[PDB]
Write a protein that binds this ligand. Structure first.
Ligand SMILES: Nc1ncnc2c1ncn2[C@@H]1O[C@H](COP(=O)(O)OP(=O)(O)OP(=O)(O)O)[C@@H](O)[C@H]1O
Ligand SMILES: Nc1ncnc2c1ncn2[C@@H]1O[C@H](COP(=O)(O)OP(=O)(O)OP(=O)(O)O)[C@@H](O)[C@H]1O
Ligand SMILES: Nc1ncnc2c1ncn2[C@@H]1O[C@H](COP(=O)(O)OP(=O)(O)OP(=O)(O)O)[C@@H](O)[C@H]1O
Ligand SMILES: Nc1ncnc2c1ncn2[C@@H]1O[C@H](COP(=O)(O)OP(=O)(O)OP(=O)(O)O)[C@@H](O)[C@H]1O
Ligand SMILES: O=c1[nH]cnc2c1ncn2[C@@H]1O[C@H](COP(=O)(O)O)[C@@H](O)[C@H]1O
Ligand SMILES: O=c1[nH]cnc2c1ncn2[C@@H]1O[C@H](COP(=O)(O)O)[C@@H](O)[C@H]1O
Ligand SMILES: O=c1[nH]cnc2c1ncn2[C@@H]1O[C@H](COP(=O)(O)O)[C@@H](O)[C@H]1O
Ligand SMILES: O=c1[nH]cnc2c1ncn2[C@@H]1O[C@H](COP(=O)(O)O)[C@@H](O)[C@H]1O
Ligand SMILES: [Mg+2]
Ligand SMILES: [Mg+2]
Ligand SMILES: [Mg+2]
Ligand SMILES: [Mg+2]
Lengths: 343, 343, 343, 343
């Protein structure tokens, strides 16, 4: 029954979850790909031939040569317009023998109302202001007179999603039928609503237990957790929040890199030194089996090799047998290296 | 590392989670007891000598002869006044060598405001109207200017909870130091926000994955899941929601029992026949290792023995090897029997 | 042929013979229950639902779900009025397919005369003064002219018992037909007429050999002997007799308990410390296979656990392989525990 | 621990218990011989050389070549004068390395008072009038002011028995020390106080369970039961009582024998035909392992051989595997034959 490989971020998000999800999908050929994304940010994957996917709704694992099911969990908050654009963009991949299943309880984003309600926190806590929490709050209100927030009710008047919206039993049966599943997490461990930076955090916990719960995955189904990290963790710009005591804020100049910016909001990313405290904390809760260390291209061999050893010792210190198996030297499939081959 | 025994409700709540938690605490002598309750639920335990505990905040496992830690998770919503009364009533048990730890991110209930904000859902969806969701929404708002909703901020002006409010690292360390842990879930599987009865449900998922996430417990720590059920499941009074296709609403009269009243509202409970569909669904997601079948005292031996076999076949049908280990015949410790000893 | 389970008291009586008899009857479902009580003893059983039986005549095992026969041996001394009240109170249990058999030679108590003849020993030896010995003496006189002492003769003029009074052959046949039998002893080992406290003793031996003889049970029929004991043995009020050299008289005050009152006389019970000498003596003669250690609720875990080990070593010392199988923590069915489950 | 061979009568007494006890004592060489006789009647043994023992108190097994202990049980009723005469008569056998132990609770017969009290029943029920029951009644009265009935109290003023009177613990220890024990019963099965002929019966049950109880022998100690019978059962003269439906009263003339008389009272013995009903009844309760068929000298080979087969079929019919091992053709050791040798 253990057939779910779960992808999670060990720092403050934007580490390369999309890159390893696409890479693992191409290598392991999962028949089911599942997620529970909110409109916060888009994940990128670039394959060997240079084709690029930027997803806010669909999992990045749709590039799997054995794709049979694409499932969007109960914890999802999505723009119907975005989902339509994303499906159409990968129509060749999402063919007649691929089933797209939207959980009946997934939240439909009202872009007019939900973005307007997040205008204040977009400045005060440096929030993305995408409407994710405002939509989540409307769901929680449980007004029986409101038939415009969950997918099951929206499907009654919006036929664009109607074919995809399934029942709870159809959802359970699809997981049961699945041979091998790729589950994709979002945001990052330190962004968790219940980690130390509150209120400078996101609207949910970004931990394996919360992701499985938001995707409706039974715990005995979990096979492996693949954690992702950067050599220099980033945080998204403005009054976004603090850092750990053993890390310092850097500049893109110090690193000799072109300043990194968010895709749509064009907010410059804040960059920090590696934090061993952050790793111990993330290793304790997230307990990954395998680690993908990305942006090794910003350091020299001794620098990224030293971080590999730090991560493995951080894991062991928190009863975790995490192995840094993959190393990222660029944004493409061809830039993902096996650790054992480069060091 | 696998030392967490988790107690969860397989139906619509109020099945005897309080009773088995107290029973297991006395038998297994856990050093740590942990929960993440909201004010919408109350749990009862009665020991061999007739002492009674009715808890809305504190775990029921505080009766453990080796109690060292009492921990209230980040997912908790609590009335400070209630916590003070619950502590005072078990002051003999909660002695100088017992540490009470309230997660810094646990929510402090604003009795007046939060209850006022749930007037309406209390009638429309048959909600408890205890303020649980309204408090949860205020936390989610993440207003940096609001220092009155999370325990960490409230402790700065309310010295009643100040000694108990810990840091995130203190929380992680307490779990790490623990020898054996009793984790107590609340509400019930079918009350989940993401199960089929939405909006006639609670404000979170009532599944093992969500409980571990709300208590901040790493997944490799889970040892055993003990699922609880009744021979005749119950719901709260009013327009509380629908039922499964294979079950029917009954009356206390039909059962020959004195009408049951809800724990928080002095309201009459709705009673239904046993549902095999509900069991298959609960077994699939919750995957319990052991089952406590309670209220066998409302049936004849053939009746409750037949339900034991139904539960085990429902389990096997959903790849779960659940064993009905305990049988309940009354509200006290002495009424919990080993299934092996009675059938 | 070995199908008789015999219940006997290892000390001075009133240790919980009634309780274990009811408990074993409910668990093992004996078709035949047999005794040979005199009016000097009363035995109590309280079931899981709170129903109480206090018997001076009828066995306590009438609560057996497979009851077919209730037999009162040749050694019985009974008040017809009492037997009628005891039958009436359990008329639901003693239905049309339950045969009550009174041995033809059982003694009918002459309340006025027999009680008048025990005035004196009631003060001098602290006797119950119930008429037991006086009735027994009248039987022994064997006056062919006396048709008012044995059941067989009384039945000729007293139609209340006539249907129940059987022949000797009917008695033998009922035992032969029985599948599984529960035999209940009375008083206690140290009250034996032939133990060291004479004349401060009862009018017969309270040993397995005497009970089988008084119930007319062939010796190859004996399967198992269940001996009963208290952590602090008791005696009746007054000049009831001495104790063993290794034990001391206590007070209910010293024990922190409400003073206990005797079953027939509303008199205060004398309490003593546990005697290892009494156990060795009782184990030697009575040779029990299983032991029920009752009133563990008057001690702390170390106290009652230590007495369990004393009993087993006292047993081994007298070539007896007695196992303390049951532990009593209260007066009801739910308070009987398996020793294996609590220590 | 199984080392007690018990001798019992299967009819109405006077069958040859003394003859087989002496025979078995000489053959098996028991170190301990035990009994619990009342003054009712004397048992006879005649050895190969013609020496004769007529005992009312001492066991007949004192002829054992390995005699170490002679024990008189708590159930004994004896004349001190008789015991003195009997010991003196066998002084050569009861030497310095043989210990005589009288149970402290054995009854001392007051020949003046106890015989006078039995004058009425000696005529009415054809009783022996030896005082046995009158002495037994005085013991049962338990008057603390009476120091003249039990051996322990009589020893304080009658030094003739003082050396022999032991404690209860000395009694238990002597049985424990014993290698092989010969236990001798008295009277006979059909004479039992609780058999069908009441009041034309004796003052106790004449069954293995009552004899072991009266001798204070633990039940696990029983090895073998040797039952005794006559080809023509007798009953002791006068208005002694009835018989079984399948037997008839005969005359000594019909048998061609000299009329049999009691030793002291010179009462002619009543003689009856063999009763198969009597055997079935005796086999059921007494369950003997071996049978001694005596007075085969009053019949022809086909007559006594036919009774052997009747007895074995009677045994089998009552779940008894009794083997008629010994056949009696006279009153002497030399007259006891092994069955396998004569048929
Ligand atoms: N090692 C790398 N060097 C340079 N650019 C990279 C590397 N790995 C990934 N990228 C780019 O980093 C950017 C930031 O990540 P973004 O959130 O947009 O998607 P992602 O890489 O899949 O990250 P995540 O899914 O963790 O949010 C992406 O545009 C991606 O193409
Ligand atoms: N077998 C039973 N028969 C009768 N009453 C019972 C039984 N088990 C529990 N009870 C009582 O019925 C009620 C059912 O519980 P509701 O909260 O009230 O459950 P709980 O045991 O208190 O805990 P939980 O809500 O977690 O199930 C409680 O008041 C409890 O004491
Ligand atoms: N563990 C216990 N703790 C407290 N009370 C008990 C316990 N066991 C029995 N009792 C009660 O104390 C009394 C002791 O019994 P006494 O006759 O009264 O014993 P019994 O159980 O009634 O039978 P028996 O005389 O054969 O021992 C009874 O009233 C009984 O219900
Ligand atoms: N087969 C026999 N033939 C003739 N006389 C016998 C035979 N066996 C025993 N006797 C005599 O029968 C008589 C009657 O028995 P009595 O009670 O006096 O002693 P017992 O033979 O040992 O009998 P029991 O011990 O059974 O009472 C004795 O005097 C005895 O010697
Ligand atoms: O996917 C993500 N990548 C990076 N930062 C994120 C992501 N999601 C949320 N955040 C950060 O989390 C905080 C709160 O985000 P919100 O959930 O959009 O309100 C802000 O500081 C965001 O920049
Ligand atoms: O402990 C509980 N027992 C039973 N029903 C509950 C409990 N908690 C919440 N509910 C149900 O959850 C829904 C809303 O209650 P609320 O979560 O308190 O708002 C209703 O359908 C209630 O009946
Ligand atoms: O059931 C009983 N429990 C306790 N003592 C008893 C019981 N039956 C008899 N006795 C004791 O036996 C002696 C005489 O009581 P009697 O047998 O009723 O005459 C006294 O020492 C009593 O204390
Ligand atoms: O040892 C015995 N042999 C034969 N008859 C006996 C013996 N003991 C008692 N009886 C008979 O038993 C009856 C009652 O005897 P009691 O016990 O002496 O009063 C009478 O019919 C006696 O003849
Ligand atoms: Mg991103
Ligand atoms: Mg409840
Ligand atoms: Mg009693
Ligand atoms: Mg004789």
């Amino acid at each position: 029954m253990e057939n779910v490989d779960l992808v999670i971020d060990l720092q403050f998000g934007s580490t390369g979850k999309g890159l390893i999800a696409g890479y693992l999908a191409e290598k392991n050929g999962y028949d089911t790909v599942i997620n529970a994304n909110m409109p916060n940010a888009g994940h990128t994957y670039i394959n060997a031939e240079g084709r690029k996917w930027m997803h806010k709704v669909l999992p990045n694992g749709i590039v799997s040569p054995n794709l049979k099911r694409v499932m969007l969990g109960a914890g999802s908050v999505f723009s119907i317009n975005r989902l339509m654009e994303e499906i159409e963009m990968s129509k060749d991949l999402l063919h007649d023998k691929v089933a797209i299943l939207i959980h009946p309880m997934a939240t439909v984003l009202d872009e007019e109302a939900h973005k307007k309600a997040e205008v204040g926190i977009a400045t005060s806590i440096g929030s993305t202001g995408q409407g994710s929490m405002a939509a989540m709050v409307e769901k929680l209100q449980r007004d029986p007179t409101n038939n415009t927030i969950v997918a099951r009710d929206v499907a009654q008047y919006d036929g664009r999603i109607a074919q995809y919206v399934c029942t709870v039993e159809e959802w359970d049966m699809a997981l049961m039928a699945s041979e091998r599943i790729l589950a994709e997490g979002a945001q990052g461990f330190s962004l968790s609503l219940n980690q130390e930076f509150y209120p400078y955090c996101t609207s949910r916990d970004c931990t394996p237990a919360r992701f499985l719960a938001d995707m409706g995955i039974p715990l005995p189904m979990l096979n492996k957790v693949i954690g992702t990290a950067r050599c220099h963790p980033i945080r998204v710009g403005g009054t976004s929040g603090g850092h750990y005591p053993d890390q310092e804020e850097l500049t893109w100049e110090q690193l000799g890199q072109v300043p990194e910016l968010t895709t749509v909001t064009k907010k410059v990313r804040r960059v920090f030194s590696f934090s061993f405290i952050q790793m111990q904390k993330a290793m304790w809760t997230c307990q990954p089996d395998e680690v993908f260390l990305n942006f090794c291209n910003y350091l020299s061999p001794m620098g990224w090799q030293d971080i590999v050893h730090q991560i493995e010792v951080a894991a062991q210190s928190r009863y975790c047998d995490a192995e840094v198996k993959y190393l990222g030297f660029g944004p493409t499939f061809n830039d993902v290296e096996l650790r054992e081959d480069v060091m």
